[model samples]
Target: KVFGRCELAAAMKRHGLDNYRGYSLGNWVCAAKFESNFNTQATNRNTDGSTDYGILQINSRWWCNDGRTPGSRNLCNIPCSALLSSDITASVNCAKKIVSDGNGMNAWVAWRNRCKGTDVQAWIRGCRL
Candidate 1:
Protein backbone atom coordinates (compact mmCIF):
# COMPACT_ATOMS: atom_id res chain seq x y z
CA LYS A 1 0.00 0.00 0.00
CA VAL A 2 1.12 3.54 -0.73
CA PHE A 3 0.71 6.28 1.84
CA GLY A 4 0.85 9.99 1.39
CA ARG A 5 3.57 11.77 3.34
CA CYS A 6 1.25 13.25 5.91
CA GLU A 7 -0.67 10.03 6.33
CA LEU A 8 2.55 8.16 6.93
CA ALA A 9 3.70 10.75 9.46
CA ALA A 10 0.49 10.42 11.42
CA ALA A 11 0.64 6.66 11.31
CA MET A 12 4.26 6.58 12.44
CA LYS A 13 3.42 8.90 15.29
CA ARG A 14 0.57 6.67 16.37
CA HIS A 15 2.99 3.75 16.26
CA GLY A 16 5.28 5.51 18.81
CA LEU A 17 8.02 6.41 16.39
CA ASP A 18 7.94 9.90 17.85
CA ASN A 19 10.71 8.79 20.20
CA TYR A 20 11.62 5.28 19.25
CA ARG A 21 15.08 4.04 20.09
CA GLY A 22 16.34 7.60 20.61
CA TYR A 23 15.50 8.60 17.06
CA SER A 24 12.93 11.28 16.44
CA LEU A 25 9.78 10.93 14.37
CA GLY A 26 11.23 13.41 11.90
CA ASN A 27 14.14 11.11 11.27
CA TRP A 28 11.88 8.19 10.45
CA VAL A 29 9.68 10.36 8.30
CA CYS A 30 12.61 11.69 6.34
CA ALA A 31 14.10 8.25 5.85
CA ALA A 32 10.83 6.79 4.63
CA LYS A 33 10.37 9.60 2.15
CA PHE A 34 13.74 9.16 0.54
CA GLU A 35 13.93 5.39 0.87
CA SER A 36 10.50 4.26 -0.34
CA ASN A 37 8.27 7.29 -0.69
CA PHE A 38 5.95 5.53 1.74
CA ASN A 39 5.21 2.64 -0.62
CA THR A 40 5.00 -0.51 1.44
CA GLN A 41 5.84 -2.70 -1.57
CA ALA A 42 8.89 -0.73 -2.56
CA THR A 43 12.02 -2.69 -3.29
CA ASN A 44 15.27 -1.83 -5.03
CA ARG A 45 18.06 -4.04 -6.27
CA ASN A 46 21.40 -2.58 -5.31
CA THR A 47 24.46 -2.76 -7.54
CA ASP A 48 25.77 -5.47 -5.24
CA GLY A 49 22.73 -7.58 -6.27
CA SER A 50 21.05 -7.38 -2.85
CA THR A 51 17.61 -5.85 -2.59
CA ASP A 52 16.28 -3.31 -0.12
CA TYR A 53 12.83 -4.05 1.20
CA GLY A 54 9.86 -2.08 2.48
CA ILE A 55 9.31 1.56 3.43
CA LEU A 56 12.50 1.64 5.49
CA GLN A 57 14.28 -0.29 2.75
CA ILE A 58 15.74 -2.86 5.12
CA ASN A 59 18.39 -4.56 3.04
CA SER A 60 18.62 -8.24 2.25
CA ARG A 61 22.38 -8.26 2.75
CA TRP A 62 22.07 -7.68 6.46
CA TRP A 63 18.48 -7.44 7.60
CA CYS A 64 16.24 -10.07 6.02
CA ASN A 65 16.11 -12.93 3.58
CA ASP A 66 14.63 -12.63 0.14
CA GLY A 67 15.07 -16.38 -0.49
CA ARG A 68 16.61 -15.82 -3.93
CA THR A 69 19.35 -13.52 -2.69
CA PRO A 70 22.53 -15.50 -2.19
CA GLY A 71 24.03 -15.49 1.31
CA SER A 72 21.32 -13.35 2.84
CA ARG A 73 22.19 -12.64 6.45
CA ASN A 74 18.55 -12.35 7.64
CA LEU A 75 19.48 -10.69 10.91
CA CYS A 76 15.85 -9.86 11.56
CA ASN A 77 14.77 -13.45 10.92
CA ILE A 78 12.07 -12.13 8.66
CA PRO A 79 11.33 -12.84 5.03
CA CYS A 80 11.85 -9.81 2.84
CA SER A 81 8.40 -10.29 1.38
CA ALA A 82 6.90 -9.79 4.84
CA LEU A 83 8.13 -6.22 4.86
CA LEU A 84 5.99 -5.30 1.89
CA SER A 85 2.71 -5.69 3.65
CA SER A 86 0.56 -2.61 4.10
CA ASP A 87 0.16 -3.33 7.81
CA ILE A 88 3.86 -2.42 8.41
CA THR A 89 3.98 -3.83 11.95
CA ALA A 90 6.77 -6.21 11.01
CA SER A 91 8.62 -3.56 9.09
CA VAL A 92 8.42 -1.15 12.01
CA ASN A 93 9.74 -3.73 14.41
CA CYS A 94 12.62 -4.56 12.11
CA ALA A 95 13.44 -0.89 11.73
CA LYS A 96 13.57 -0.48 15.47
CA LYS A 97 15.88 -3.43 15.75
CA ILE A 98 18.13 -1.97 13.09
CA VAL A 99 18.36 1.38 14.83
CA SER A 100 19.01 -0.30 18.13
CA ASP A 101 21.91 -2.18 16.58
CA GLY A 102 24.00 1.03 16.43
CA ASN A 103 23.44 2.05 12.84
CA GLY A 104 20.57 4.28 13.87
CA MET A 105 19.16 5.97 10.77
CA ASN A 106 22.60 5.69 9.23
CA ALA A 107 21.49 2.22 8.10
CA TRP A 108 19.74 4.03 5.25
CA VAL A 109 22.04 5.90 2.89
CA ALA A 110 19.08 7.99 1.89
CA TRP A 111 18.96 9.37 5.39
CA ARG A 112 22.65 10.12 5.43
CA ASN A 113 22.73 11.94 2.13
CA ARG A 114 19.32 13.56 2.10
CA CYS A 115 17.93 13.79 5.59
CA LYS A 116 20.96 14.06 7.81
CA GLY A 117 21.81 17.50 9.21
CA THR A 118 18.84 18.90 7.38
CA ASP A 119 15.82 20.24 9.19
CA VAL A 120 13.82 17.02 9.39
CA GLN A 121 10.69 18.89 10.36
CA ALA A 122 10.32 19.82 6.72
CA TRP A 123 9.52 16.20 5.99
CA ILE A 124 6.52 16.38 8.27
CA ARG A 125 5.40 19.88 7.38
CA GLY A 126 1.70 20.45 7.89
CA CYS A 127 1.16 16.98 9.31
CA ARG A 128 -0.96 17.01 12.45
CA LEU A 129 0.91 14.63 14.69
Candidate 2:
Protein backbone atom coordinates (compact mmCIF):
# COMPACT_ATOMS: atom_id res chain seq x y z
CA LYS A 1 0.00 0.00 0.00
CA VAL A 2 1.27 3.43 -0.89
CA PHE A 3 0.09 6.09 1.49
CA GLY A 4 -0.59 9.73 1.03
CA ARG A 5 1.66 12.16 2.92
CA CYS A 6 -0.54 12.66 5.91
CA GLU A 7 -2.15 9.27 5.34
CA LEU A 8 0.88 7.37 6.52
CA ALA A 9 1.24 9.85 9.32
CA ALA A 10 -2.15 8.90 10.65
CA ALA A 11 -1.30 5.22 10.51
CA MET A 12 2.03 5.67 12.23
CA LYS A 13 0.53 8.00 14.75
CA ARG A 14 -2.10 5.42 15.57
CA HIS A 15 0.65 2.91 16.13
CA GLY A 16 2.58 5.05 18.61
CA LEU A 17 5.04 6.73 16.25
CA ASP A 18 4.29 10.25 17.44
CA ASN A 19 7.13 11.38 19.72
CA TYR A 20 8.53 7.90 19.84
CA ARG A 21 12.05 8.14 21.28
CA GLY A 22 11.68 11.90 21.49
CA TYR A 23 11.60 12.34 17.75
CA SER A 24 8.65 14.35 16.51
CA LEU A 25 5.97 13.02 14.19
CA GLY A 26 7.35 15.25 11.47
CA ASN A 27 10.73 13.56 11.70
CA TRP A 28 9.25 10.14 11.06
CA VAL A 29 6.94 11.52 8.45
CA CYS A 30 9.79 13.16 6.58
CA ALA A 31 12.02 10.14 6.87
CA ALA A 32 9.30 7.90 5.52
CA LYS A 33 8.77 10.26 2.63
CA PHE A 34 12.39 9.86 1.61
CA GLU A 35 13.02 6.37 2.86
CA SER A 36 10.07 4.63 1.26
CA ASN A 37 7.68 7.27 0.08
CA PHE A 38 5.08 5.59 2.25
CA ASN A 39 5.19 2.39 0.25
CA THR A 40 4.56 -0.62 2.38
CA GLN A 41 6.61 -2.88 0.12
CA ALA A 42 9.65 -0.72 -0.42
CA THR A 43 12.97 -2.48 -0.23
CA ASN A 44 16.52 -1.31 -0.67
CA ARG A 45 19.52 -3.55 -1.04
CA ASN A 46 22.65 -2.06 0.47
CA THR A 47 26.23 -2.67 -0.70
CA ASP A 48 26.95 -4.13 2.72
CA GLY A 49 25.08 -7.35 1.85
CA SER A 50 22.11 -6.13 3.84
CA THR A 51 18.62 -5.13 2.83
CA ASP A 52 16.26 -2.55 4.24
CA TYR A 53 12.63 -3.55 4.35
CA GLY A 54 9.25 -1.87 4.45
CA ILE A 55 7.94 1.64 4.93
CA LEU A 56 10.48 2.76 7.49
CA GLN A 57 13.08 0.51 5.89
CA ILE A 58 14.24 -1.38 8.93
CA ASN A 59 17.47 -3.14 8.07
CA SER A 60 18.16 -6.85 8.00
CA ARG A 61 21.65 -6.67 9.46
CA TRP A 62 20.61 -5.66 12.92
CA TRP A 63 16.89 -5.27 13.21
CA CYS A 64 15.48 -8.18 11.27
CA ASN A 65 16.26 -11.77 10.36
CA ASP A 66 16.33 -11.94 6.61
CA GLY A 67 18.80 -14.84 6.72
CA ARG A 68 20.67 -13.06 3.96
CA THR A 69 22.64 -10.32 5.69
CA PRO A 70 26.34 -11.08 6.17
CA GLY A 71 26.13 -11.11 9.93
CA SER A 72 22.69 -10.40 11.21
CA ARG A 73 22.18 -9.76 14.87
CA ASN A 74 18.45 -9.86 14.17
CA LEU A 75 17.90 -8.03 17.40
CA CYS A 76 14.25 -7.72 16.61
CA ASN A 77 14.23 -11.47 15.96
CA ILE A 78 11.37 -10.87 13.53
CA PRO A 79 11.31 -11.83 9.89
CA CYS A 80 12.32 -9.01 7.61
CA SER A 81 9.48 -9.99 5.31
CA ALA A 82 7.15 -9.00 8.08
CA LEU A 83 8.06 -5.42 7.42
CA LEU A 84 6.51 -5.52 4.00
CA SER A 85 3.02 -6.07 5.24
CA SER A 86 0.46 -3.32 4.92
CA ASP A 87 -0.21 -3.73 8.59
CA ILE A 88 2.57 -1.85 10.33
CA THR A 89 2.51 -3.45 13.75
CA ALA A 90 5.53 -5.60 13.07
CA SER A 91 7.54 -2.85 11.43
CA VAL A 92 6.62 -0.32 14.06
CA ASN A 93 7.54 -2.72 16.84
CA CYS A 94 10.91 -3.38 15.25
CA ALA A 95 11.36 0.33 14.67
CA LYS A 96 10.72 0.94 18.32
CA LYS A 97 13.30 -1.68 19.10
CA ILE A 98 15.79 0.05 16.84
CA VAL A 99 15.39 3.30 18.73
CA SER A 100 15.47 1.53 22.07
CA ASP A 101 18.72 -0.12 21.02
CA GLY A 102 20.28 3.34 21.31
CA ASN A 103 20.60 3.85 17.58
CA GLY A 104 17.95 6.59 17.68
CA MET A 105 16.78 7.73 14.25
CA ASN A 106 20.37 7.65 13.00
CA ALA A 107 19.78 4.03 12.05
CA TRP A 108 18.77 5.36 8.67
CA VAL A 109 21.16 7.85 7.10
CA ALA A 110 18.25 8.83 4.88
CA TRP A 111 16.69 10.22 8.04
CA ARG A 112 19.95 11.76 9.14
CA ASN A 113 20.72 13.29 5.77
CA ARG A 114 17.29 14.21 4.48
CA CYS A 115 15.08 14.56 7.52
CA LYS A 116 17.38 15.64 10.32
CA GLY A 117 18.62 19.12 11.24
CA THR A 118 15.91 20.74 9.19
CA ASP A 119 12.48 22.23 9.73
CA VAL A 120 10.33 19.14 9.27
CA GLN A 121 7.06 20.82 10.07
CA ALA A 122 6.04 20.71 6.45
CA TRP A 123 5.71 16.96 6.68
CA ILE A 124 3.10 17.22 9.37
CA ARG A 125 1.50 20.51 8.58
CA GLY A 126 -2.31 20.55 8.66
CA CYS A 127 -2.32 16.89 9.68
CA ARG A 128 -4.50 16.27 12.65
CA LEU A 129 -2.59 14.16 15.14
Candidate 3:
Protein backbone atom coordinates (compact mmCIF):
# COMPACT_ATOMS: atom_id res chain seq x y z
CA LYS A 1 0.00 0.00 0.00
CA VAL A 2 1.19 3.58 -0.62
CA PHE A 3 -0.06 4.71 2.76
CA GLY A 4 1.35 3.97 6.15
CA ARG A 5 -0.63 3.75 9.40
CA CYS A 6 0.62 7.15 10.53
CA GLU A 7 0.13 8.68 7.10
CA LEU A 8 -3.38 7.35 7.02
CA ALA A 9 -4.06 8.81 10.43
CA ALA A 10 -2.53 12.09 9.42
CA ALA A 11 -4.50 12.19 6.22
CA MET A 12 -7.73 11.57 8.07
CA LYS A 13 -6.98 14.23 10.65
CA ARG A 14 -5.80 16.75 8.12
CA HIS A 15 -8.79 16.24 5.83
CA GLY A 16 -11.36 15.95 8.61
CA LEU A 17 -12.06 12.34 7.84
CA ASP A 18 -12.21 11.15 11.43
CA ASN A 19 -14.89 8.91 12.88
CA TYR A 20 -14.68 6.27 10.19
CA ARG A 21 -14.04 8.82 7.50
CA GLY A 22 -11.29 8.29 4.97
CA TYR A 23 -10.50 8.16 1.29
CA SER A 24 -10.60 4.88 -0.55
CA LEU A 25 -7.31 4.35 -2.29
CA GLY A 26 -9.24 2.42 -4.86
CA ASN A 27 -11.37 5.44 -5.54
CA TRP A 28 -8.55 7.97 -5.30
CA VAL A 29 -6.35 5.75 -7.36
CA CYS A 30 -9.12 5.43 -9.87
CA ALA A 31 -9.49 9.17 -10.00
CA ALA A 32 -5.75 9.54 -10.42
CA LYS A 33 -5.73 6.79 -12.95
CA PHE A 34 -8.39 8.57 -14.92
CA GLU A 35 -6.82 11.96 -14.39
CA SER A 36 -3.16 11.12 -14.90
CA ASN A 37 -2.95 7.37 -15.18
CA PHE A 38 -1.09 7.19 -11.88
CA ASN A 39 1.80 8.91 -13.54
CA THR A 40 2.38 11.31 -10.66
CA GLN A 41 4.10 13.37 -13.31
CA ALA A 42 1.98 14.40 -16.25
CA THR A 43 1.63 17.56 -18.29
CA ASN A 44 -0.50 19.05 -21.06
CA ARG A 45 -0.06 21.85 -23.58
CA ASN A 46 -2.56 24.06 -25.38
CA THR A 47 -2.45 25.65 -28.83
CA ASP A 48 -1.96 29.05 -27.22
CA GLY A 49 1.44 28.11 -25.78
CA SER A 50 -0.17 27.64 -22.36
CA THR A 51 0.63 24.48 -20.45
CA ASP A 52 -0.60 22.05 -17.81
CA TYR A 53 2.03 20.06 -15.97
CA GLY A 54 2.75 17.58 -13.16
CA ILE A 55 1.05 14.51 -11.85
CA LEU A 56 -2.21 16.39 -11.46
CA GLN A 57 -1.61 17.96 -14.84
CA ILE A 58 -2.35 21.47 -13.58
CA ASN A 59 -2.23 24.50 -15.85
CA SER A 60 0.32 26.60 -13.94
CA ARG A 61 1.15 29.20 -16.57
CA TRP A 62 -1.54 31.43 -15.16
CA TRP A 63 0.16 31.72 -11.83
CA CYS A 64 3.65 31.53 -13.21
CA ASN A 65 3.23 33.76 -16.24
CA ASP A 66 -0.02 35.71 -15.74
CA GLY A 67 -1.97 34.41 -18.71
CA ARG A 68 -5.48 35.77 -19.18
CA THR A 69 -7.85 32.97 -20.18
CA PRO A 70 -10.40 32.28 -17.49
CA GLY A 71 -9.20 29.63 -14.96
CA SER A 72 -6.05 31.63 -14.39
CA ARG A 73 -4.45 32.59 -11.09
CA ASN A 74 -6.73 35.63 -11.12
CA LEU A 75 -9.70 33.31 -10.87
CA CYS A 76 -8.64 30.90 -8.11
CA ASN A 77 -6.45 31.06 -5.01
CA ILE A 78 -4.53 27.81 -5.25
CA PRO A 79 -1.78 28.28 -7.81
CA CYS A 80 -1.22 25.69 -10.52
CA SER A 81 2.25 24.79 -9.32
CA ALA A 82 0.85 23.43 -6.10
CA LEU A 83 -1.16 20.91 -8.06
CA LEU A 84 2.04 19.72 -9.70
CA SER A 85 3.55 18.84 -6.37
CA SER A 86 4.04 15.26 -5.30
CA ASP A 87 1.32 15.56 -2.72
CA ILE A 88 -1.63 14.21 -4.62
CA THR A 89 -3.88 14.91 -1.68
CA ALA A 90 -3.10 18.61 -1.84
CA SER A 91 -3.78 18.72 -5.54
CA VAL A 92 -7.08 16.94 -5.14
CA ASN A 93 -8.13 19.22 -2.31
CA CYS A 94 -7.15 22.28 -4.30
CA ALA A 95 -9.17 21.09 -7.26
CA LYS A 96 -12.11 20.41 -4.98
CA LYS A 97 -11.98 23.91 -3.63
CA ILE A 98 -11.70 25.37 -7.10
CA VAL A 99 -14.39 23.21 -8.73
CA SER A 100 -16.80 22.18 -5.95
CA ASP A 101 -15.71 24.17 -2.90
CA GLY A 102 -14.11 21.33 -0.96
CA ASN A 103 -15.76 18.39 -2.65
CA GLY A 104 -12.92 16.46 -4.25
CA MET A 105 -14.81 13.23 -4.77
CA ASN A 106 -17.08 15.18 -7.05
CA ALA A 107 -14.13 16.12 -9.25
CA TRP A 108 -15.05 13.29 -11.55
CA VAL A 109 -18.27 15.07 -12.35
CA ALA A 110 -16.43 18.34 -12.95
CA TRP A 111 -13.79 16.60 -15.03
CA ARG A 112 -16.29 14.75 -17.17
CA ASN A 113 -18.48 17.82 -17.42
CA ARG A 114 -15.80 20.38 -18.23
CA CYS A 115 -12.12 19.40 -18.40
CA LYS A 116 -12.79 16.07 -20.10
CA GLY A 117 -10.55 16.44 -23.14
CA THR A 118 -7.82 18.23 -21.21
CA ASP A 119 -5.92 15.56 -19.22
CA VAL A 120 -8.20 14.02 -16.61
CA GLN A 121 -10.74 12.33 -18.83
CA ALA A 122 -9.32 8.90 -18.17
CA TRP A 123 -11.76 8.29 -15.34
CA ILE A 124 -14.86 8.22 -17.52
CA ARG A 125 -14.06 4.87 -19.07
CA GLY A 126 -14.11 2.53 -16.05
CA CYS A 127 -13.68 2.22 -12.27
CA ARG A 128 -10.28 0.61 -12.40
CA LEU A 129 -7.41 2.38 -10.71
Candidate 4:
Protein backbone atom coordinates (compact mmCIF):
# COMPACT_ATOMS: atom_id res chain seq x y z
CA LYS A 1 0.00 0.00 0.00
CA VAL A 2 2.99 2.23 0.47
CA PHE A 3 3.74 1.73 -3.17
CA GLY A 4 0.13 2.56 -3.82
CA ARG A 5 0.91 5.75 -1.90
CA CYS A 6 -1.52 4.74 0.83
CA GLU A 7 -0.69 5.07 4.50
CA LEU A 8 -1.50 1.42 5.09
CA ALA A 9 -0.04 1.18 8.56
CA ALA A 10 -1.93 4.20 9.73
CA ALA A 11 -5.04 2.87 8.06
CA MET A 12 -4.70 -0.42 9.87
CA LYS A 13 -4.10 1.36 13.12
CA ARG A 14 -7.18 3.47 12.67
CA HIS A 15 -9.49 0.62 11.73
CA GLY A 16 -8.01 -2.40 13.50
CA LEU A 17 -8.38 -4.19 10.19
CA ASP A 18 -5.85 -6.54 8.75
CA ASN A 19 -4.98 -7.39 5.18
CA TYR A 20 -7.56 -9.55 3.48
CA ARG A 21 -7.60 -13.17 4.49
CA GLY A 22 -6.34 -15.52 1.77
CA TYR A 23 -5.98 -12.58 -0.57
CA SER A 24 -3.02 -10.30 -0.53
CA LEU A 25 -2.97 -6.67 -1.50
CA GLY A 26 -0.88 -7.79 -4.44
CA ASN A 27 -3.93 -9.59 -5.80
CA TRP A 28 -6.16 -6.68 -4.97
CA VAL A 29 -3.69 -4.38 -6.66
CA CYS A 30 -3.82 -6.46 -9.78
CA ALA A 31 -7.61 -6.39 -9.65
CA ALA A 32 -7.47 -2.64 -9.37
CA LYS A 33 -5.09 -2.48 -12.30
CA PHE A 34 -7.47 -4.39 -14.53
CA GLU A 35 -10.59 -2.69 -13.22
CA SER A 36 -9.47 0.86 -13.74
CA ASN A 37 -6.41 0.32 -15.86
CA PHE A 38 -4.29 1.63 -12.99
CA ASN A 39 -5.85 5.00 -13.45
CA THR A 40 -5.99 6.29 -9.91
CA GLN A 41 -7.74 9.30 -11.27
CA ALA A 42 -10.49 7.28 -12.89
CA THR A 43 -14.16 7.85 -12.15
CA ASN A 44 -16.76 6.32 -14.39
CA ARG A 45 -17.54 9.09 -16.82
CA ASN A 46 -20.25 6.77 -18.00
CA THR A 47 -23.40 6.06 -15.90
CA ASP A 48 -24.14 9.74 -16.29
CA GLY A 49 -21.13 10.62 -14.11
CA SER A 50 -22.26 8.46 -11.22
CA THR A 51 -19.53 6.17 -9.95
CA ASP A 52 -17.03 5.28 -7.28
CA TYR A 53 -13.60 6.44 -6.15
CA GLY A 54 -9.99 5.31 -5.49
CA ILE A 55 -7.71 2.27 -6.06
CA LEU A 56 -10.07 -0.27 -4.57
CA GLN A 57 -12.34 1.67 -6.85
CA ILE A 58 -14.66 2.43 -3.96
CA ASN A 59 -17.85 4.40 -4.42
CA SER A 60 -17.13 7.31 -2.12
CA ARG A 61 -20.44 9.11 -2.47
CA TRP A 62 -22.27 5.91 -1.71
CA TRP A 63 -20.11 5.13 1.29
CA CYS A 64 -20.13 8.54 2.80
CA ASN A 65 -22.40 11.53 2.80
CA ASP A 66 -19.38 13.49 1.69
CA GLY A 67 -16.40 12.54 -0.39
CA ARG A 68 -13.30 11.42 1.48
CA THR A 69 -11.23 14.21 2.94
CA PRO A 70 -7.58 14.34 1.85
CA GLY A 71 -8.50 11.40 -0.31
CA SER A 72 -11.28 13.46 -1.83
CA ARG A 73 -13.47 12.00 -4.58
CA ASN A 74 -10.48 12.32 -6.87
CA LEU A 75 -8.64 9.04 -7.36
CA CYS A 76 -5.26 10.65 -8.14
CA ASN A 77 -4.66 11.51 -4.49
CA ILE A 78 -3.86 8.70 -2.09
CA PRO A 79 -7.11 7.04 -1.04
CA CYS A 80 -6.35 7.24 2.62
CA SER A 81 -10.04 7.25 3.51
CA ALA A 82 -10.66 3.99 1.70
CA LEU A 83 -7.62 2.39 3.30
CA LEU A 84 -8.42 3.59 6.80
CA SER A 85 -12.04 2.60 7.13
CA SER A 86 -14.51 -0.28 7.26
CA ASP A 87 -15.76 0.56 3.78
CA ILE A 88 -12.94 -1.50 2.32
CA THR A 89 -14.21 -4.60 4.04
CA ALA A 90 -17.78 -3.70 3.32
CA SER A 91 -17.18 -3.26 -0.38
CA VAL A 92 -15.07 -6.40 -0.67
CA ASN A 93 -17.61 -8.37 1.28
CA CYS A 94 -20.35 -7.06 -0.96
CA ALA A 95 -18.42 -8.28 -3.97
CA LYS A 96 -17.91 -11.73 -2.50
CA LYS A 97 -21.49 -11.87 -1.40
CA ILE A 98 -22.71 -11.22 -4.89
CA VAL A 99 -20.39 -13.85 -6.27
CA SER A 100 -21.66 -16.45 -3.81
CA ASP A 101 -25.30 -15.77 -4.53
CA GLY A 102 -25.06 -17.35 -8.01
CA ASN A 103 -26.38 -14.39 -9.93
CA GLY A 104 -22.69 -14.64 -10.29
CA MET A 105 -20.08 -12.01 -10.55
CA ASN A 106 -22.54 -9.45 -11.79
CA ALA A 107 -21.71 -6.92 -9.09
CA TRP A 108 -18.00 -7.60 -9.11
CA VAL A 109 -17.52 -7.70 -12.87
CA ALA A 110 -19.88 -4.83 -13.57
CA TRP A 111 -17.71 -2.75 -11.31
CA ARG A 112 -15.10 -2.96 -14.04
CA ASN A 113 -16.99 -3.79 -17.21
CA ARG A 114 -20.43 -2.15 -17.15
CA CYS A 115 -18.88 1.07 -18.43
CA LYS A 116 -18.03 -0.90 -21.51
CA GLY A 117 -20.38 -3.16 -23.49
CA THR A 118 -18.93 -6.43 -22.22
CA ASP A 119 -21.17 -9.35 -21.31
CA VAL A 120 -20.93 -8.61 -17.58
CA GLN A 121 -22.95 -11.64 -16.56
CA ALA A 122 -20.66 -13.95 -18.47
CA TRP A 123 -17.58 -12.19 -17.20
CA ILE A 124 -18.69 -12.79 -13.62
CA ARG A 125 -19.48 -16.47 -14.07
CA GLY A 126 -15.91 -17.48 -13.15
CA CYS A 127 -15.21 -14.85 -10.53
CA ARG A 128 -14.04 -15.72 -7.04
CA LEU A 129 -13.72 -13.71 -3.86
In terms of lDDT, the best-performing candidate is: 2
Q: Write the per-residue lDDT of candidate 4 for residues 33-91, one digit (tens) a residue.
A: 55545444445532444355444454543332234333424332333244334334443
Q: What TM-score against the true fold does each predicted structure earn?
A: 0.92, 0.94, 0.45, 0.36
Deviating ranges (above 4 Å) for candidate 3: 1-27, 60-71, 74-76, 101-129
Tens digits of per-residue lDDT, candidate 3, 1-129, equal: 233334433443455433212343333434444456555456667676666654444555443332444554533455555556556565555443444435545535424545434443232334222
Model 4: weakest 10-residue lDDT segment is 1-10
The residue pairs in collision within model 2 are none
Ranking by TM-score: 2, 1, 3, 4
CA-lDDT, candidates in order? 0.87, 0.88, 0.45, 0.38
**Candidate 1 residues 18-122, lDDT tens each?**
779777788898999889989999999998899998999999998898877787698889989999999878888888888888877887889999998999988
Worst 10 residues of 2 by lDDT: 94-103
Which has the better TM-score: candidate 1, or candidate 4? 1
In angstroms, the error of model 4 at 109 is 2.1
Cα deviation of 104 in candidate 2 (Å)? 1.5
Question: How many backbone overlaps does candidate 2 show?
Answer: 0
Model 2 Cα lDDT, one tens digit per residue, 46-117: 999999999999989888888888767888888899999989889888888887777799987899999899
TM-score of 2: 0.94
Model 1: residue 40 alpha-carbon error in angstroms: 0.9
